[PDB]
Amino acid sequence: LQGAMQQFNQRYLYSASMLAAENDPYGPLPPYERGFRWKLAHFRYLCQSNALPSHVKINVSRQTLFEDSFQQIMALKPYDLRRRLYVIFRGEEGLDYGGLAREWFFLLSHEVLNPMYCLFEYNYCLQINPASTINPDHLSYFCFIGRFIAMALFHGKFIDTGFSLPFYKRMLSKKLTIKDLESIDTEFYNSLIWIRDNNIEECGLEMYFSVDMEILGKVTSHDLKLGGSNILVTEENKDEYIGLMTEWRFSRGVQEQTKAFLDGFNEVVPLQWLQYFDEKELEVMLCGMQEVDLADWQRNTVYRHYTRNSKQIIWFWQFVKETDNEVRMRLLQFVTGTCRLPLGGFAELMGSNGPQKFCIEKVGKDTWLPRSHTCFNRLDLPPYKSYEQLKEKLLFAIEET
Numbered sequence: 001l002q003g004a005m006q007q008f009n010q011r012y013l014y015s016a017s018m019l020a021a022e023n024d025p026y027g028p029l030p031p032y033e034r035g036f037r038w039k040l041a042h043f044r045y046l047c048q049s050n051a052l053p054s055h056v057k058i059n060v061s062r063q064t065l066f067e068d069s070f071q072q073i074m075a076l077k078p079y080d081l082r083r084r085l086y087v088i089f090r091g092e093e094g095l096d097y098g099g100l101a102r103e104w105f106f107l108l109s110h111e112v113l114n115p116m117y118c119l120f121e122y123n124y125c126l127q128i129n130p131a132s133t134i135n136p137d138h139l140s141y142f143c144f145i146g147r148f149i150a151m152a153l154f155h156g157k158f159i160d161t162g163f164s165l166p167f168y169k170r171m172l173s174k175k176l177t178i179k180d181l182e183s184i185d186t187e188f189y190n191s192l193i194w195i196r197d198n199n200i201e202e203c204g205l206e207m208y209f210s211v212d213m214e215i216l217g218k219v220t221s222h223d224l225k226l227g228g229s230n231i232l233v234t235e236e237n238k239d240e241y242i243g244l245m246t247e248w249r250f251s252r253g254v255q256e257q258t259k260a261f262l263d264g265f266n267e268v269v270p271l272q273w274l275q276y277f278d279e280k281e282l283e284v285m286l287c288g289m290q291e292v293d294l295a296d297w298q299r300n301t302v303y304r305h306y307t308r309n310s311k312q313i314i315w316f317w318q319f320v321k322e323t324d325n326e327v328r329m330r331l332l333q334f335v336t337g338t339c340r341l342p343l344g345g346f347a348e349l350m351g352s353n354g355p356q357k358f359c360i361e362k363v364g365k366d367t368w369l370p371r372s373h374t375c376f377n378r379l380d381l382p383p384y385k386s387y388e389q390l391k392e393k394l395l396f397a398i399e400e401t
Contacts, residue, residue, distance in 0.1 A: 011288035021045040055084035066111040078267035109159035130253025139260045146264025158288045168279040207233040278401040292328040300346035304361035334398045337374030370397040
């Protein structure tokens with residue numbers, strides 16, 4: 001876990017500006033844009049204005065960190081988690097000046113992935129496991145992870161493992177789109193788009209407004225509307241079916257765990273305080289910024305119907321070499337779905353289905369906007385006619401929510 005730590009603290013140094021708070025509420029002095037730095041600054045003023053005096057003790061032994069933290073975080077009243085965090089590592093070194101709590105958040109965000117609690121699949125990716133019910137108390141563990149995550153946001157602390165963009169979208173209660181499903185289940189997504197596009201009453205297919213899932217062998221059949229199991233998907237109603245199926249796929253097998261996480265979060269940091277962030281900003285707020293190395297990225301990128309020498313590839317690397325780091329990370333999220341980089345850099349980039357390098361493919365014509373497939377870390381780049389056209393389209397597309 002040591003290599004992850006060095007990279008962890010280094011993100012704390014790159015990201016210091018993220019701890020700045022607005023001074024007054026009255027605005028800059030005079031000498032649509034997303035306004036991230038200012039939303040972050042106003043969020044910190046909000047938490048800081050809502051901090052409570054004194055502290056809560058958190059007393060952990062390293063060899064037993066998760067269970068001890070679970071016990072002690074769960075027994076504190078939720079709003080007592082807005083006092084100062086004071087963490088002691090039992091019989092070890094000195095006192096918490098803030099530094100041991102940074103350690104604690106780092107170690108906790110990793111210790112939660114330990115297989116013996118069965119909460120998550122399999123790393124820095126948290127995907128809730130449907131079979132988490134194996135653990136009879138998994139609902140109370142998810143509350144704790146909800147409280148633990150809010151505490152980090154409240155206290156301006158980072159964690160080294162995060163959820164996926166569509167998950168943070170439900171956490172900000174944004175309407176999930178079918179393009180989001182592509183990011184979570186491409187086969188399910190292909191079949192939804194197939195149904196939408198082709199005649200079902202001439203394929204002879206027969207589907208019903210009901211869907212089923214299999215968890216540790218036990219199959220359970222959920223109805224998408226009243227009577228849906230007897231209702232036939234026809235040419236007339238297949239748009240509704242696609243809608244309810246998209247919604248249902250985002251939390252399949254994990255509805256209960258997700259409510260236990262959200263409610264635990266909401267008790268510490270009301271979800272409303274986040275309403276103006278988007279899911280990419282929320283993701284960065286939890287794990288920090290890092291500098292994005294352009295050289296490693298460029299030599300581990302792969303092209304479909306483009307080359308090193310296509311003029312749009314040249315323009316793309318010129319766009320990247322000349323934008324700020326905050327823009328490079330946001331393009332990283334557009335294309336890969338995360339701001340995080342694997343330990344081994346871009347040569348080790350991974351897709352949902354095994355290894356997959358950052359990929360740029362030529363599709364369509366000059367009038368199209370850029371599209372992403374985050375599951376295959378593939379950027380669909382139209383053959384634009386000029387650098388300025390490329391810059392403006394790529395900029396509009398990484399910024400679009």
